[PDB]
Design a protein around this ligand. Structure first.
Ligand SMILES: CCCCCCCCCCCCCCCCCC(=O)OC[C@H](CO[C@@H]1O[C@H](CO[C@H]2O[C@H](CO)[C@H](O)[C@H](O)[C@H]2O)[C@H](O)[C@H](O)[C@H]1O)OC(=O)CCCCCCCCCCCCCCCCC
Ligand SMILES: CCCCCCCCCCCCCCCCCC(=O)OC[C@H](CO[C@@H]1O[C@H](CO[C@H]2O[C@H](CO)[C@H](O)[C@H](O)[C@H]2O)[C@H](O)[C@H](O)[C@H]1O)OC(=O)CCCCCCCCCCCCCCCCC
Ligand code: CLA
Ligand code: CLA
Ligand code: CLA
Ligand code: CLA
Ligand code: CLA
Ligand SMILES: CCCCCCCCCCCCCCCCCC(=O)OC[C@H](CO[C@@H]1O[C@H](CO)[C@H](O)[C@H](O)[C@H]1O)OC(=O)CCCCCCCCCCCCCCCCC
Ligand SMILES: CC1=C(/C=C/C(C)=C/C=C/C(C)=C/C=C/C=C(C)/C=C/C=C(C)/C=C/C2=C(C)CCCC2(C)C)C(C)(C)CCC1
Ligand SMILES: CC1=C(/C=C/C(C)=C/C=C/C(C)=C/C=C/C=C(C)/C=C/C=C(C)/C=C/C2=C(C)CCCC2(C)C)C(C)(C)CCC1
Ligand SMILES: CC1=C(/C=C/C(C)=C/C=C\C(C)=C\C=C\C=C(C)\C=C\C=C(C)\C=C\C2=C(C)CCCC2(C)C)C(C)(C)CCC1
Lengths: 54, 135, 33, 120, 156, 92, 37, 31, 61, 34, 76, 34, 450
């Protein structure tokens, strides 16, 4: 309704489904570019802006 | 100037008058503005506009409250407009000072000064004591 | 022969005193309800 | 700006002042009568909107004061009576049932016998 | 008229002092004592104060409060039986708002203090179990509260 | 309506209409405002001034206080636009 | 009121809260002392 | 003495001090 | 009595407030004067403790 | 009226996700001093 | 010449100012205190707004007879 | 009835105000790290 | 002197505190000195408020803002919200005032005499604004401290005396919160709900159990996050998104503090559980509802049947229905039908106000509360007149709620301006063109015509 206290206004399954689909679609598009990042201690830098390619 | 002719007010029902000292005026104004002013500012009643503090309303009350003694008695024992029922539990008074903590440090001189201020205001402002927002 | 950082202090003191006197008078005397 | 309100104000104030002199002139108070020369002049100047009437009023006032400067208790009374008759001056007191002389301040009837106020 | 110097009063120490408008007086313009320089009233317990402390009227008012509070407390079991929790929560706060004041005003001896504390804890538990919708605990707490208030009034 | 004939009986004169006047009209008769006027202004139409004594529940005191001022009362036809506001008409 | 023993000090308590403004002004005074380096 | 600058500054600073003294005197008048 | 103790505390605090920054700012003064400052700090703490103890004794029943 | 809610939610989440993941794509390095 | 930064330092300036300024300040204080301003400018005193006879606001009501009207309103 | 409150307030505020320029001037005289 | 003039640093005198960016010894002293100033103000203000106390008036008629927090924590308050003693306030003030001296001495020492940079003699307390590990370590440490503080508040609520509960069963009084709520759905539904009318976001907390449970969850989360940020290093997706410099961190903090200031101001304006109304006065809606209640009671006592009365518009003079069905008060106060107050709940049923209770079960104390709250509404002027804007000078009253709301709202907006300015400058300086455009290699001149 109006004055109820649902999380993010979700009162039906379809709303949650479409929210998930949106975040995940854009996330997959972003992953297609940034999905090969590693945490090894040679990808770091010493500066104010990350110019180390990708 | 505030002469003695303008400081003469009626004290009892017979009609005898008195002269208020210049210090009593200041004390009465201070105590009234401190204690009454939230609800009785300008001589009106905010929570019941049918019962004002102008002299005409005080005169058409049952125990007649247009003098110092009646005002002091009302402050010690409030009643309704016809004087039939006691309203001490919904109005500040000495009798119900255990409910209202702002009346626990009042002496007889304080009540006398407050009543004097109420009686004196109409002679000074005139038709603006209890008149409302029109004036 | 006073350096130009003490005379300004005296002027500021005088201005502050004058302003405080007028803001107090707002609060007492004529024109104070 | 001269208008009817100016005449009303001047007529009220100065006619009341002049009519207050009836008891004084009945017996004779030459000094007290001459004490209202300013009131007479003001009533003549600002309470009559007519050239001929103004001239007649000035003539009557001059006659009144000329009789005053003669220790003449009879001519003074006659001139005062004819001035009152000509200019229609009388003492007026109002009530509250048919009243409302004034409502606010700034009025020339605020604390006078003409001032009555009805508060609902 | 023709010439008159206006009245002067410097901070209330150099001048008249009482001119219907002084400010910063802190007393010193009246023949009476005040609670403090920042106060207008006098001391509460002074010799000329019209209000006593603990007179007959106060005691009568508190005892009437306690008696009517007992009478009101005798309704809760029916509400719990009918499962009307809002009635249980409203009864403990509609008339019984002054019960704490009366009880704390009429308690002097330590055993009275212990009884008062136990009664307050019992009614708090009753309200909590009413808002949690548990019938058995609410009924037990109501019975305990009734017994405790009866004991406290008896000890008076 | 533009023209109302009995406008003087609403509290602006010495006579009060029992069927249309507000409760404030009784404030100028001492000893009557908070008790008897409230009963008068909350009961049905009166065909006469004598009908006010038949109100179910009138104690004696109200009866004689009404008898004292009976000479100031009258009962006219009921105007629905005035009779509906007899406790609170928006005037303060 | 303060407790009965410390009532004599109330003039000082009336002026205590305004000190940080004095600190802010003292910063400017210090800067003016060195002639705005 | 008779230079333009002296006559200016003065003819706008003397009444200022006079008026300031007047206002300071006004601040203590009682009703 | 604690009024005199509080007055002494106020005076000592005023002296410390006036003195300490001057010693800190001037080069070398804090190095040499670092034996009596300890005494003043000890007096400060002792006055605090004495005031607290006396007030607690006076007000506790 | 539920279908309108679904469509509006889809549009809003699409644009908000575009914003969020756009600012995460090494934005500080997109300056003329690279 | 000699800009202001030199005047604000010369001691003769200081002595002449310390002898001149307080005279003017005290003159203003005495002008207010003695009640002369009320006479010069006609401002009513705090107890002259209403006289014993006149209890209303005294508005001027004539153009060419303003002198007599103001004389009557003032005291007469 | 002599109103010690106002005198106390004025003296206290005067001393508090004077406390600061005093230390600044003392440092200036003693040639500190101003 | 080197490092303290425009010649050696730039940064003219009106921007002098910007010369401490790369001087890690004096910056510590400066921050410590500001902390000492804060503590000093707290102590001085509470002592000043204690000195001016009078027992006749309530706290909201004396212009106090600090005593109410201590009263809410449960110090010197009695049943119904009456002050019985002021000694604990005096003790708190004395303790704060004494601690301020130690803080100030530490600040002035670390600022004037201590080493200029700590990176050469105390490696533990040293950083570079660019070593991400050290910054995360510092953040985690001070975060763990915050979590400990929240747990301390919980411990005070549950064991060390209790807090003042205004919804207490039998009149507001101090009590122990024995069963705080821990179900995560309730707390995070407070967090994740809408901010609009009826919801209220986090402002709408309406009982003490939820408050205690929330501060418990906050403490746990803060401890866990502090340890995690201590023992880890920023990941890849965070490294390429942020700017790593001191000014950037300052801007990051400025934005959050502005948001918190806005939230606190709206707490002060709307909430009445953590801000009980007997200490701060009535809220906005509460005063209008009190006026409606007062005149309903008066008209009903005169003999009226207050359920069938018709207003000028034909809508209902005293009672009507909300757009969802609940029975509410009539008049212009139909907008404030979301109000819930301890003096009006005893008359509410499962579907709004109860007619049967209203007709013959209204107590005199509710009448007294409504009469008091109607004439102390949060309205006033700058010179503290009180009342509507067309009132005359008789009363001297402005509510503390208005002061708090206005002041902290003003501060929040200006700190948002801080986010904008300091963040823009930080990024421009990091890129390397904060001093102007280069004449020889102007970027625009090498772009295709438009
Ligand atoms: C975050 C999203 C930001 C967008 C905010 C827009 C709407 C803000 C708003 O309607 O906020 C109002 C709400 C307050 O909610 C109120 O909350 C109240 C909660 O009280 C209830 O609960 C209380 C608990 O006792 C009492 O019981 C009270 O009686 C009872 O009604 C009621 O629910 C009201 O209906 C409800 O309006 O605040 C909030 O959600 C909390 C504050 C959010 C941060 C403030 C936003 C920033 C300020 C706006 C932006 C400024 C822009 C200018 C900057 C330049
Ligand atoms: C540079 C311009 C600022 C200078 C202002 C002049 C200073 C002195 C005048 C002033 O200030 O005013 C004079 C007052 C002292 O005057 C006293 O002010 C009192 C104020 O009333 C207070 O006290 C009354 C009873 O004590 C009532 O309780 C009332 O509700 C309550 O507000 C009463 O008026 C007293 O009669 C009167 O003596 O000084 C004060 O207030 C002292 C405190 C001033 C600093 C307060 C910080 C500012 C407030 C935080 C910012 C709020 C932001 C608002 C949004 C922007
Ligand atoms: C001579 C011994 C003595 C006595 C009788 C007291 C008595 C008191 N002190 Mg105290 N105190 C003392 C020495 C003493 N103090 C010393 C030596 C210090 C350190 C300098 C303190 C520091 C101190 C502080 C900081 C406080 C007290 C407080 C108190 C009061 C409440 C104590 C309380 O709640 O218990 C404590 C209770 C528990 C530990 C468990 C419950 C009480 C009147 C408190 C007070 O006055 O509050 C208004 C307070 O805040 N005292
Ligand atoms: C935690 C808060 C915080 C911190 C640590 C800083 C820190 C800094 N800021 Mg920043 N800033 C902030 C908040 C903050 N800012 C906010 C909220 C704003 C928005 C208004 C700004 C706007 C701002 C600007 C526009 C600038 C800075 C600059 C600076 C740098 C030098 C500042 C300096 O020397 O001050 C010197 C301090 C003064 C000269 C004092 C000025 C006095 C103020 C204006 C009085 C304010 C009125 C006061 C409230 C009431 C007066 C009462 C009086 C009558 C007694 C420094 C890195 C400057 C810089 O160089 O950046 C690199 C710069 O240009 N900041
Ligand atoms: C919260 C306010 C605050 C704080 C903590 C600081 C702190 C600092 N500023 Mg700063 N500043 C401020 C406000 C502040 N400023 C404002 C508002 C302005 C604008 C006018 C400036 C303008 C400014 C400039 C232009 C410079 C600083 C510099 C400095 C640093 C060295 C100062 C120095 O050499 O002292 C020298 C000063 C003195 C020796 C005189 C002060 C003596 C003491 C400290 C006065 C206080 C004593 C106290 C009352 C007694 C308490 C004692 C205790 C035991 C109780 C220091 C970290 C300098 C810097 O960057 O250094 C690297 C610098 O060049 N500031
Ligand atoms: C958050 C606050 C803070 C922080 C981070 C520091 C940090 C520091 N202080 Mg400091 N200090 C502070 C508050 C603080 N202080 C206060 C409030 C005071 C006043 C009591 C002092 C008084 C003080 C003195 C007197 C001295 C320090 C010293 C030091 C340094 C060495 C400390 C050490 O070896 O401990 C190591 C602890 C664990 C590994 C270090 C940089 C010392 C220093 O650097 O001298 C050269 C030193 O002599 N401080
Ligand atoms: C003051 C609060 C605070 C602040 C400023 C930070 C700051 C940060 N956190 Mg962190 N965090 C905190 C509290 C905080 N944390 C708490 C309490 C928890 C526990 C729930 C976490 C759990 C957490 C996780 C799980 C992660 C961060 C990460 C990060 C980094 C990126 C944040 C981002 O992109 O959004 C940043 C350094 C991210 C990161 O870079 O990891 C190292 C990341 O993955 N945080
Ligand atoms: C911080 C910024 C981080 C986000 C960066 C992205 C910024 C993008 C700009 C966002 C604007 C678009 C948002 C529109 C959402 C909207 O209107 O929701 C509208 C919904 C209201 O939804 C309504 O809800 C009603 C409830 O009865 C009914 O269900 C209605 O049907 C439903 O529409 O509100 C929310 O979803 C608010 C939730 C967000 C509040 C909690 C935030 C959690 C984190 C808090 C920290 C930040 C504070
Ligand atoms: C660095 C710097 C700065 C800063 C500074 C600071 C910030 C400082 C601080 C300071 C401080 C922060 C201080 C404090 C102090 C304190 C004290 C000193 C206290 C004392 C106390 C006392 C003395 C008390 C007493 C008492 C008692 C005990 C009881 C009651 C009564 C009384 C209250 C009296 C400046 C900016 C200027 C400048 C630059 C540099
Ligand atoms: C205590 C308490 C409580 C609470 C609790 C809680 C649990 C809280 C929480 C809270 C929270 C949990 C919060 C959070 C927040 C978050 C945030 C605030 C975020 C933000 C974000 C950001 C800021 C980002 C940004 C960005 C983007 C988006 C893009 C890219 C870039 C960046 C990254 C920058 C309660 C009410 C219950 C009750 C009372 C008590
Ligand atoms: C707590 C205490 C105390 C106190 C302490 C303190 C902490 C104080 C200090 C501080 C202070 C309190 C300081 C002050 C100072 C300030 C001043 C006095 C300032 C002034 C200013 C001015 C006047 C400025 C001006 C100017 C210039 C010069 C130039 C530029 C412009 C200007 C205009 C800004 C004592 C000892 C009693 C002891 C007891 C406790």
């Amino acid at each position: 309704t109006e004055g109820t206290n649902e999380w993010f206004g979700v009162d039906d399954i379809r709303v949650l489904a479409v929210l998930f689909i949106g975040h995940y679609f854009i996330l997959s598009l972003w992953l297609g570019q940034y999905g090969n990042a590693t945490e090894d201690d040679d990808a770091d830098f010493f500066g104010e802006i990350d110019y180390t390619g990708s | 100037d505030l002469d003695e002719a303008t400081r003469t007010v009626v004290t009892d029902s017979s009609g005898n008058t008195t002269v208020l000292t210049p210090e009593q005026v200041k004390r009465g104004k201070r105590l009234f503005n401190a204690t009454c002013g939230a609800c009785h500012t300008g001589g009106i009643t905010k929570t019941n506009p049918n019962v004002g503090l102008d002299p005409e309303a005080l005169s058409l009350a049952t125990p007649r409250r247009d003098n110092i003694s009646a005002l002091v008695d009302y402050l010690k024992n409030p009643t309704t407009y016809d004087g039939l029922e006691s309203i001490a539990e919904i109005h500040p008074s000495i009798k119900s000072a255990d409910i209202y903590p702002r009346m626990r440090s009042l002496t007889d001189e304080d009540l006398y000064s407050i009543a004097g201020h109420i009686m004196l205001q109409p002679k000074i402002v005139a038709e603006k004591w209890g008149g409302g927002k029109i004036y | 022969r006073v350096p130009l950082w003490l005379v300004g202090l005296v002027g500021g003191f005088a201005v502050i005193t004058i302003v405080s006197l007028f803001i107090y008078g707002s609060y007492s005397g004529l024109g104070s309800s | 700006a001269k208008s009817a309100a100016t005449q009303s104000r001047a007529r009220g104030i100065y006619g009341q002042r002049i009519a207050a002199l009836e008891s004084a002139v009945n017996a004779g108070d030459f000094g007290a009568v001459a004490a209202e020369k300013n009131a007479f002049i003001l009533f003549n100047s600002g309470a009559i909107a007519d050239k001929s009437k103004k001239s007649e009023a000035v003539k009557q006032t001059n006659a009144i004061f000329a009789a005053i400067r003669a220790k003449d208790a009879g001519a003074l009374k006659s001139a005062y009576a004819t001035y009152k008759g000509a200019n229609d001056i009388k003492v007026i007191v109002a009530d509250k049932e048919s009243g409302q002389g004034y409502s606010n301040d700034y009025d020339f009837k605020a604390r006078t016998t003409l001032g009555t106020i009805y508060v609902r | 008229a023709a010439g008159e110097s206006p009245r002067f009063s410097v901070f209330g120490v150099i001048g008249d002092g009482t001119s219907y408008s002084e400010g910063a007086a802190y007393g010193s313009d009246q023949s009476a004592e005040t609670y403090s320089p920042y106060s207008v009233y006098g001391k509460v317990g002074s010799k000329d104060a019209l209000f006593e402390a603990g007179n007959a009227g106060e005691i009568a008012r508190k005892k009437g409060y306690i008696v009517e509070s007992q009478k009101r407390l005798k309704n809760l079991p029916g509400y719990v039986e009918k499962k009307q929790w809002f009635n249980v929560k409203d009864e403990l706060t509609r008339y019984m708002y002054e019960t704490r004041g009366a009880v704390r005003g009429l308690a002097q001896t330590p055993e009275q203090k212990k009884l008062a504390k136990a009664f307050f804890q019992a009614i708090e538990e009753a309200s909590l179990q009413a808002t949690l919708k548990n019938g058995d605990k609410c009924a037990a707490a109501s019975a305990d509260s009734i017994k405790l208030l009866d004991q406290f009034y008896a000890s008076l | 309506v533009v023209d109302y004939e009995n406008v003087a009986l609403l509290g602006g004169s010495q006579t009060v209409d029992l069927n249309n006047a507000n409760v404030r009209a009784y404030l100028r008769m001492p000893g009557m405002y908070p008790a008897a006027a409230g009963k008068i202004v909350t009961h049905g139409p009166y065909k006469s001034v004598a009908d006010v004594y038949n109100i179910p529940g009138l104690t004696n005191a109200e009866k004689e206080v009404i008898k004292k001022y009976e000479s100031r009362f009258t009962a006219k036809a009921v105007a629905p636009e005035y009779a509906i506001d007899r406790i609170n008409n928006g005037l303060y | 009121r303060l407790p009965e023993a410390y009532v004599v000090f109330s003039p000082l308590v009336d002026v205590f809260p305004v000190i940080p403004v004095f600190f802010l002004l003292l910063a400017f005074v210090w800067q003016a002392a060195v002639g705005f380096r | 003495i008779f230079t333009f600058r002296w006559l200016a500054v003065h003819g706008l600073a003397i009444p200022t001090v006079f008026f300031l003294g007047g206002i300071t005197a006004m601040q203590f008048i009682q009703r | 009595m604690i009024t005199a103790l509080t007055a002494l505390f106020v005076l000592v605090s005023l002296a410390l407030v006036v003195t300490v920054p001057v010693a800190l700012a001037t080069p070398g003064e804090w190095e040499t004067s670092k034996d009596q400052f300890n005494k003043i700090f000890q007096l400060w703490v002792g006055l605090v403790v004495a005031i607290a103890t006396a007030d607690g004794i006076s007000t506790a029943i | 009226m539920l279908t309108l809610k679904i469509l509006v939610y889809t549009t809003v989440i699409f644009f908000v996700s575009l914003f969020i993941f756009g600012f995460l794509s090494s934005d500080p390095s997109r300056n003329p001093n690279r | 010449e000699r800009p202001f930064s030199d005047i604000i330092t010369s001691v003769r300036y200081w002595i002449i100012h310390t002898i001149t300024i307080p005279s003017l300040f005290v003159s203003g204080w005495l002008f207010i205190s003695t009640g002369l301003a009320y006479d010069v400018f006609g401002t009513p005193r705090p107890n002259e707004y209403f006289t014993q006879d006149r209890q209303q606001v005294p508005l001027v009501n004539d153009r060419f007879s303003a002198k007599q009207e103001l004389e009557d309103l003032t005291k007469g | 009835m002599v109103n010690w409150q106002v005198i106390g307030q004025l003296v206290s505020t005067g001393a508090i105000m004077l406390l600061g320029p005093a230390i600044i001037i003392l440092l200036a005289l003693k040639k500190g790290n101003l | 002197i080197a490092g303290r003039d425009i010649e050696s640093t730039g940064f003219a005198w009106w921007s002098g505190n910007a010369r401490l960016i790369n001087v890690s010894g004096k910056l510590l002293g400066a921050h410590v000195a500001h902390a000492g100033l804060m503590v000093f103000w707290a102590g001085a203000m509470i002592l000043f408020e204690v000195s001016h106390f009078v027992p006749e008036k309530p706290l909201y008629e004396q212009g106090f803002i600090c005593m109410q927090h201590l009263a809410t924590l449960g110090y010197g308050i009695g049943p119904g919200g009456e002050i019985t003693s002021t000694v604990p306030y005096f003790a708190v003030g004395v303790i704060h005032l004494i601690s301020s001296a130690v803080l100030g001495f530490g600040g002035i020492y670390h600022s004037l005499l201590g080493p200029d940079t700590l990176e050469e003699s105390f490696p533990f307390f040293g950083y570079d604004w660019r070593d991400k590990n050290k910054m995360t370590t510092i953040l985690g440490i001070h975060l763990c401290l915050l979590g400990l503080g929240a747990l301390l508040l919980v411990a005070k609520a549950m064991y060390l005396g209790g807090v003042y509960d205004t919804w207490a069963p039998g009149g507001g009084d101090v009590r122990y919160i024995t069963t705080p709520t821990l179900n995560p759905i309730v707390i995070f539904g407070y967090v994740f709900r809408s901010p609009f009318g009826g919801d209220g976001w986090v402002v709408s907390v309406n009982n003490m159990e939820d408050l205690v449970g929330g501060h418990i969850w906050v403490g746990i989360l803060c401890i866990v996050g502090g340890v995690w940020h201590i023992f880890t290093k920023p990941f890849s997706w965070a490294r390429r998104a942020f700017v790593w410099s001191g000014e950037a961190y300052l801007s990051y903090s400025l934005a959050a503090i502005s948001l918190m200031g806005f939230t606190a101001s709206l707490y002060a304006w709307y909430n009445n559980t953590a801000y009980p109304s007997e200490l701060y006065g009535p809220t906005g809606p509460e005063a209008s509802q009190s006026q409606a209640f007062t005149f309903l009671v008066r008209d009903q006592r005169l003999g009226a049947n207050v359920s069938s009365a018709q207003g000028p518009t034909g809508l209902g003079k005293y009672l009507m229905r909300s757009p969802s069905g609940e029975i509410i008060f009539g008049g212009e106060t139909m907008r404030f039908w979301d109000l819930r107050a301890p003096w009006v709940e005893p008359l509410r049923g499962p579907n709004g106000l109860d007619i049967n209770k209203i007709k013959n079960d209204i107590q005199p104390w509710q009448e007294r509360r409504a009469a008091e709250y109607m004439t102390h509404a949060p309205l006033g002027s700058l010179n503290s007149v009180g009342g509507v804007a067309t009132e005359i000078n008789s009363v001297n009253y402005v509510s503390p709620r208005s002061w708090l709301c206005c002041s902290h709202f003003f501060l929040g907006f200006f700190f948002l301006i801080g986010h904008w300015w300091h963040s823009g400058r930080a990024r421009a300086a990091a890129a390397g063109f904060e001093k102007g455009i280069n004449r020889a290699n102007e970027p625009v001149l090498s772009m295709r015509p438009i």
